[PDB]
Amino acid sequence: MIPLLAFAAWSGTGKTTLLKKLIPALCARGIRPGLIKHTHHDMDSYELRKAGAAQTIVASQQRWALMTETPDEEELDLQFLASRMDTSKLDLILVEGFKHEEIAKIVLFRDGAGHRPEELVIDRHVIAVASDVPLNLDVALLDINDVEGLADFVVEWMQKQN
Amino acid sequence: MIPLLAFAAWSGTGKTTLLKKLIPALCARGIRPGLIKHTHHDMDSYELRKAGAAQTIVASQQRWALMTETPDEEELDLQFLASRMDTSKLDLILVEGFKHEEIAKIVLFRDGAGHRPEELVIDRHVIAVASDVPLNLDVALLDINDVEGLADFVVEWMQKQN
């Protein structure tokens, strides 16, 4: 069985500069990571799509994409976007963007650009905050600057469900 | 089932073009098409992918893309790439751009495109040649400029397979 894990972060690119470093670190510990992100800014062979091929798929020498049109009214369900991935080549699926979900979540605080503490609806799911300034809790707390430790806490969490 | 039909050719014969017209046509006849395309031409959360996310899938409201990296073995198994699509909203999958493959196939030709017809190979998988000119050979010879004419043939072809 394979797990999924959220990565909440308030306004401010950060988590992309963060994750940009946590991914490799995760490979480092032999973890094959998958990432299901959710945006708003909406995304080759584009025309051929607007022409009518709902599902288009471009393959190349290095990578292959798969597009799937849904002017239906959807595409928020994770569990489905999951089954879509080749999960036999994955160990952990990172989940960023989807708001209001019941999966393990890891916050992210970085003062200066933004507000002050206590801001963290510690859902009955959140399992650790990652600040750059100390602070209390009732759940793990990491230094949003030690990718290594973070990578390690994560790997830990995993093996303790698995 | 859920047939796979390919369009072979030569550079400069309007392969891409013909499909911009053929797609709509198939749609008009109630045929939902999926297009699988290859390009030795290397074709948005780019950082986290080359960073280590073998599979990044960017969701949205209108549609979603599952982008897979393959820095070892480039994917050339049509059967695989097809099994990656959601065939429950597709009745036909068009295959284009993969040199040397062996599926249902319609060849393209246009006098003057730097090749004479004798240079055409009608292999076990050729279901019809679509020229812009009569050619003396024994295989469904269709007019390449009559799309609706073409569409009908496909549609019929499909039925004989289902």
Phi, psi values for residue A40, rounded to 5°: -140, -30
Assess whether B58 and B119 both reside in one domain: no
Assess whether B37 and B96 both reside in one domain: yes
Indicate the residue of B59, B67, B85 with minimum beta-carbon distance to A65. Answer: B67
Assess whether A108 and A63 both reside in one domain: no
Provide CB contacts within 8 A for B79, sequence distance 6+.
Answer: none
Q: What is the CATH number of the domain that holds A51?
A: 2.20.25.120
Assess whether A81 and A97 both reside in one domain: yes
Provide CB contacts within 8 A for A110, sequence distance 6+.
Answer: A12, A14, A131, A132, A144
**Cβ–Cβ of B57/A86 closer than 8 Å?**
no
Assess whether A33 and A52 both reside in one domain: no
Query: Would you tell me how many other CB atoms lie within 10 Å of the CB of residue B141?
Result: 16
CB B63 within 8 Å of CB A43: yes
CB B105 within 8 Å of CB B130: no
CB A87 within 8 Å of CB A2: yes
Any idea which residue has 């369900």 for tokens? A77
> Where are the extended beta strands (E) located within A51-126?
55-59, 63-69, 92-96
Assess whether B153 and B100 both reside in one domain: yes
Assess whether A37 and A78 both reside in one domain: yes
Cα B115 to Cα B110: distance, rounded to the nearest angstrom: 8
Assess whether A62 and A129 both reside in one domain: no
Assess whether A145 and A89 both reside in one domain: yes
> Domain residues for A60?
44-73
Kindly provide the resolution of this structure in angstroms, with one decimal: 2.8
CB B69 within 8 Å of CB A63: yes
Provide CB contacts within 8 A for B91, sequence distance 6+.
Answer: B2, B3, B31, B32, B33, B158
* Technique used by the depositors: X-ray
Pairing of strands A55-59, A33-38: unpaired
Assess whether B67 and B79 both reside in one domain: no
Which helix (H) or strand (E) segment holds residue A158: the answer is helix A147-159
Provide CB contacts within 8 A for B31, sequence distance 6+.
Answer: B91, B92, B154, B155, B158
Pick the closest to residue A53 from B90, B48, B137, B66 (CA basis): B90
Assess whether B112 and B56 both reside in one domain: no
Assess whether B28 and B64 both reside in one domain: no
Q: Tell me, what amino acid is at A87? A: T
Q: List the single best residue of A42, A57, A86 to mutate versus B (max B Cβ within 10 A).
A: A57
Cα B19 to Cα B93: distance, rounded to the nearest angstrom: 12
- The alpha carbons of chain B give a radius of gyration, in whole angstroms, of 18
Indicate the residue of A24, A34, A65 with minimum beta-carbon distance to B65. Answer: A65
| Nearest-10 Cα torsion for A20, A25, A26, A32 | 80
Within its chain, how far is the Cα of B35 from the centroid? 6
